[PDB]
Amino acid sequence: DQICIGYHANNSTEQVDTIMEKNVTVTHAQDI
Amino acid sequence: PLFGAIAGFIEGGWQGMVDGWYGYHHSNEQGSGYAADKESTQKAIDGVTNKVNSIIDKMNTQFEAVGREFNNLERRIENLNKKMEDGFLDVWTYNAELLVLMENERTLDFHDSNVKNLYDKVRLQLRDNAKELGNGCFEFYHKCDNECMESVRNGTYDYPQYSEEARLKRE
Amino acid sequence: TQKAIDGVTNKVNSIIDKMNTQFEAVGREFNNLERRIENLNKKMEDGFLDVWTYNAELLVLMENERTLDFHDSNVKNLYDKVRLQLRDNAKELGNG
Ligand SMILES: *[C@@H]1O[C@H](CO)[C@@H](O)[C@H](O)[C@H]1NC(C)=O
Ligand SMILES: *[C@@H]1O[C@H](CO)[C@@H](O)[C@H](O)[C@H]1NC(C)=O
Ligand SMILES: *[C@@H]1O[C@H](CO)[C@@H](O)[C@H](O)[C@H]1NC(C)=O
């Protein structure tokens, strides 16, 4: 009787950049 | 492939659960579904679109380069114009790129804190009537069916209702 | 420690990379009947220097708080990792 908590995924290859790490794969991203 | 939930004790995401950004996964004797926690997904989406719209709004008053022409005895003024326009384009390029970097890390930390806050909400509701398995799961100690599953997913879990079987099952 | 040092060196390197295209002051000369344009040049160069000084100093301030909170979150995530695996076999003493 587990009620495990988690999050959503795809197989997407959308990549963003942050301050401390590049090539960050994300579920959803918006090119601007 | 800051907060410690996304790529933390919860090791990976769930491909099957596509209704929301965050949700649950119950596995009882009556079935095994992949539900989504609303009013957390909607709050996250509202915050993310609000952040994006603020990034669009703050950049409306950028610098617009216009074409100014000068002759061969106006080379200092031409150099001044070139340096002014290029410096303003460099300033706004730095502003856009650096704002994208900070708000990207803030968005990732926001999703992480949302997942950890959902985890802590379930932890503070179940209390001792469950068992933290360490990966984000709560193995229930009493007999929990869909009726208490929806109350865990709601926020209306009733702690005094279920305490007899947990003590007996422990050794 | 490896992830932390990779993160801080990546942060520092992105700080260096974003500031390659700053403003470079170039010396331009004007005569005594070109004092308005001389003032315009002085104000432009000084305003761009002020803008990039503000950018560098403020970025240093934010990234310093982010680095300190990153080290703090790394220590707390190690503590929470050890608590999660130990379960009830151990006992939190409060000090860590
Ligand atoms: C990832 O970022 C690096 C810079 O570190 C860049 O060279 C590379 O092209 C990026 N990856 C992809 C798949 O574009
Ligand atoms: C992943 O997110 C993308 C956008 O990057 C979206 O189109 C998609 O529905 C999600 N799922 C899959 C299976 O690609
Ligand atoms: C959960 O909330 C919904 C919406 O208010 C309600 O219809 C449902 O009965 C609730 N479930 C429980 C177990 O209280």
Burial of C54-70, coded b for 16+ CB within 10 Å and e otherwise, reads ebeeebeeebeebbeeb
Closest C-alpha to B103, from A12, A13, A30, C71: A30
The structure was resolved to a resolution in Å of 2.7
DSSP string, chain C: -HHHHHHHHHHHHHHHHHTSS----------TT-HHHHHHHHHHHHHHHHHHHHHHHHHHHHHHHHHHHHHHHHHHHHHHHHHHHHTTSS---S--
Burial of B145-155, coded b for 16+ CB within 10 Å and e otherwise, reads eeebbeebbee
C77: tokens are 């995530």
Q: Using alpha carbons, list the distances in angstroms from residue B71 to B81, B82, B85, C7.
A: 13, 14, 18, 51
Is the separation of the CB atoms in B96 and B62 below 8 Å?
Answer: no
B5: tokens are 């939930």
Closest C-alpha to C8, from B102, B103, A20: A20
Q: Which of A4, A17, A18, A20 to mutate to test the interface with C (most CBs of C within 10 A)?
A: A20
The DSSP call for residue B16 is S
Distance CA A25, CA B165 (A): 45
Q: Burial of A12 by CB count in 10 Å (0-12 exposed, 13-18 middle, 19+ buried)?
A: exposed
Helix (H/G/I), strand (E/B), else coil: B134: coil
Distance CA B146, CA B170 (A): 23
The DSSP call for residue B127 is T
* C41: Cα separation from own chain's centroid: 30
Q: What amino acid is encoded at B86 in this protein?
A: D
The residues pairing with B14 across neighbouring beta strands, listed in sequence order, are: A8
Helix (H/G/I), strand (E/B), else coil: B114: helix
Contacts of A20 (CB under 8 A, 6+ apart): B105, C6, C7, C8, C10, C11, C14, C70
φ, ψ at B25 (rounded to 5°): -150, 100
∠B139-B142-B148 over CA atoms, to 5°?
Answer: 85
Residue B62 backbone zone (phi > 0: left; psi -120 to 50: alpha; other: beta): beta
Alpha helices in chain B (DSSP H): 41-58, 75-126, 146-154, 165-169
Ligand 1 centroid to B48 CA: how many Å?
25
Distance CA B53, CA B57 (A): 6
The DSSP call for residue B21 is S
Chains in contact with chain C (at least 3 beta-carbon pairs closer than 8 A): A, B
State which approach was used to obtain the coordinates: cryo-EM
H or E element at residue A13: none
Q: What amino acid is encoded at B138 in this protein?
A: F
- Choosing from A11, A15, A16, A27 the residue with most ligand 2 atoms within 8 A of its CB, the one to mutate for a pocket test is A27
Closest C-alpha to B117, from B15, B3, B1: B3
Q: Burial of B119 by CB count in 10 Å (0-12 exposed, 13-18 middle, 19+ buried)?
A: buried
User: Could you tell me whether strands A24-26 and A2-7 are parallel, antiparallel, or unpaired per DSSP bridges?
Assistant: unpaired
Closest C-alpha to B151, from B128, B129, B125: B125
Contact A11 B15 (CB under 8 A): yes
Q: Which of A2, A18, A25 to mutate to test the interface with B (most CBs of B within 10 A)?
A: A2
Nearest ligand 1 atom to the CA of A17 is: 2
The residues pairing with A2 across neighbouring beta strands, listed in sequence order, are: B27
H or E element at residue B32: strand B31-33
Tell me if chain A has a CB within 8 Å of the CB of B116. no
Which residue bears the tokens 């930390």? B109
